[PDB]
Amino acid sequence: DIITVTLDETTSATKSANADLSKTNEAQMDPLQVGGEELQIGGKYNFSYDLN
Amino acid sequence: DIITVTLDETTSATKSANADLSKTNEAQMDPLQVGGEELQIGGKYNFSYDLN
């Protein structure tokens, strides 16, 4: 038996995925000055730091 | 038995998170002058400081 087929096909598929991570640090301190002079810890260490 | 499936799928998912921290200090004092002369504590220390 003869049967006619209408070819009408349309398929479409998409997918996506993304990720992000970020972190930052910034800590800075000038040498501490008390009494007109620069404070010293130990023998050669200041009250200062720098992180980045 | 023949069953027709209509492919209609749509999924979407998002997520986000962020954080902040901040701190600052700024203390400054000029050398104290009383009586026309610069006050001295101990033998060599002023009344001044500088923090940052």
Side-chain angles (χ1 to χ4, degrees):
Chain A
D1 293 329
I2 290 177
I3 170 69
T4 308
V5 174
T6 291
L7 296 179
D8 187 11
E9 298 278 22
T10 305
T11 320
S12 183
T14 70
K15 61 195 287 181
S16 186
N18 57 84
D20 284 312
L21 293 178
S22 174
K23 199 171 184 177
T24 187
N25 282 94
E26 191 180 14
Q28 204 274 336
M29 167 171 185
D30 294 341
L32 181 61
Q33 301 176 351
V34 179
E37 52 98 30
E38 177 168 304
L39 239 61
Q40 310 280 0
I41 8 184
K44 59 173 183 175
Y45 295 110
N46 281 332
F47 286 80
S48 69
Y49 51 76
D50 206 324
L51 171 71
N52 218 274
Chain B
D1 293 329
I2 290 177
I3 170 69
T4 308
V5 174
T6 291
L7 296 179
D8 187 11
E9 298 278 22
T10 305
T11 320
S12 183
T14 70
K15 61 195 287 181
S16 186
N18 57 84
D20 284 312
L21 293 178
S22 174
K23 199 171 184 177
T24 187
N25 282 94
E26 191 180 14
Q28 204 274 337
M29 167 171 185
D30 294 341
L32 181 61
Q33 301 176 351
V34 179
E37 52 98 30
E38 177 169 304
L39 239 61
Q40 310 280 0
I41 8 184
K44 59 173 183 175
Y45 295 110
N46 281 332
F47 286 80
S48 69
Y49 51 76
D50 206 324
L51 171 71
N52 218 274

